[PDB]
């Protein structure tokens, strides 16, 4: 059972050495910008296990970092399944105050509203909406 405290000590060491910008770059590089999916799953597992073995304050710091990254989601498209999975799990597990909850919900609803507005005014929206129910097609050409 030694590996548990070994992992805890290593996690504390990494949290001590690393600052905000390095963790932010790690998240952006291996959870969003990576074309491969195996790398994204490795990063998902590593981020989850860094989160689990940290203290409350570091957990809050990491959650705030991810909620700061979240507004940049549209630039990555389909590649951010694991990122939103981890973000949802973290926001569900970490106990948090009311003001932070309102901020998080506001961010989510704002992103949804902006994307809906983008969809309903798109120049090709009518063509795609009509073609959806008649032919079977993969992409938007």
């Amino acid at each position: 059972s030694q590996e548990d405290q070994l992992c805890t000590a290593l996690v504390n060491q990494l949290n001590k050495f690393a600052d905000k910008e390095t963790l932010i770059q790690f998240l952006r590089c291996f959870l969003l910008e990576s074309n491969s999916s195996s790398v994204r799953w490795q990063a998902h597992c590593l981020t989850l296990h860094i989160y689990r073995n940290s203290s409350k304050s570091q957990q809050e710091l990491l959650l705030d970092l991810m909620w700061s990254i979240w507004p940049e989601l549209p630039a990555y498209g389909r590649k951010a399944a694991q990122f939103v999975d981890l973000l949802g799990y973290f926001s569900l597990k970490t106990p948090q105050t009311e003001k932070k909850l309102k901020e998080y919900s506001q961010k989510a609803v704002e992103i949804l509203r902006t994307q809906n507005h983008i969809l309903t005014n798109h120049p090709n929206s009518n063509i795609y909406n009509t073609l959806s129910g008649l032919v079977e097609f993969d992409g938007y050409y």
Binding site: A75, V84, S105, V109, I111, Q115, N116, L119, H122
Partner: protein, 435 residues
Amino acid sequence: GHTSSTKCYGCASAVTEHCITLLRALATNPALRHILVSQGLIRELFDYNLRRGAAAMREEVRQLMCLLTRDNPEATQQMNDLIIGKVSTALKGHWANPDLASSLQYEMLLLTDSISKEDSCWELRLRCALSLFLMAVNIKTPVVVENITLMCLRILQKLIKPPAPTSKKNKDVPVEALTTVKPYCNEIHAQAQLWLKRDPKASYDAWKKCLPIRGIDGNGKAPSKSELRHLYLTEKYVWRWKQFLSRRGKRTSPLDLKLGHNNWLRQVLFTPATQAARQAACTIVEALATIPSRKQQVLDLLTSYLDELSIAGECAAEYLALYQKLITSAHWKVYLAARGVLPYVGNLITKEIARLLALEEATLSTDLQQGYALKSLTGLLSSFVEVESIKRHFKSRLVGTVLNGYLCLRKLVVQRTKLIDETQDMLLEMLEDMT
């Protein structure tokens, strides 16, 4: 090379998918649920995401919208208001455009999913479903029957007939053995006209408070004669006291168990637009007849519906199949005989035979459903007759009708089908049995 184009349709769609998934994850927290519903999320998900995206995304947003109103009466009222408003607006101009009725499937699917999930706000969703049912039950257009009345009838059918219990204590007993209250024999205390207007005095709990509990018969001792006398007149004079109090005071007056002979039941039971509506109506009316007092009115109304067999020949296939089930016991048959249904059926048979002869004389057209109603009526008369009491008693009045019908059917030479031949055979067997 990891940045998406600004105006890309697929990327915005994927961001919307991720937003829906994250919101569903978030909604599992009641506080976040309340904050989200306060943000104004229900209207956004109603207006845009209900109809856009792949089918999986559409059912996912349906689930999210259902979850956002899990125990919030205000959210449930808002969702119900949106659904009812859209359905009424479409149904106002359904007659001038069929798509308005044909483009309500996601609203009704949302209502179905909301009712199918047991929560504490079930009464409001039931009110919405019943209001939509009673608003669109009298429209004859097949698109409304297929797209509105069917969903409401399925909701009602699911509510009336609950799933079989799985508790080890109640693994065998039926659903009628689990109720904690006993309905009165001849009175209905629930009143839909006041219920649909949100009357606090006509709510669900108010209705439950007016019904006596089911006595836990822990003692199997047979009550003495004085005990039964006391029970009898105590019930009698307590009922009289309540009646006088309602007559003079402010207590509500329960309705009397007397069913009207014209209704929506007859519209739904014989609709030719679709068959599932007829089957759901049959299931509903079968479930409505459990205690013999209600079975009285059910059977009387269904006997009143006997004259529709000619107008809706094959569409009655379900209705008959229910009637025969509800009178499958001997005492119900002899009760119906005591109320004078034998002359009714005989007159119907004679009338349709006369119509058949009149049609045979003039034209030569073909009808693949000819004789179905006559076959059914003759089979029903045989069903009434086989039991010994009515056969011994009612032979002296039915011989003339049977013999006249048999001779008239024998006269047929051109407009003859297999059903008519079977009817003639059964009529001859009737004649030989009676004589």
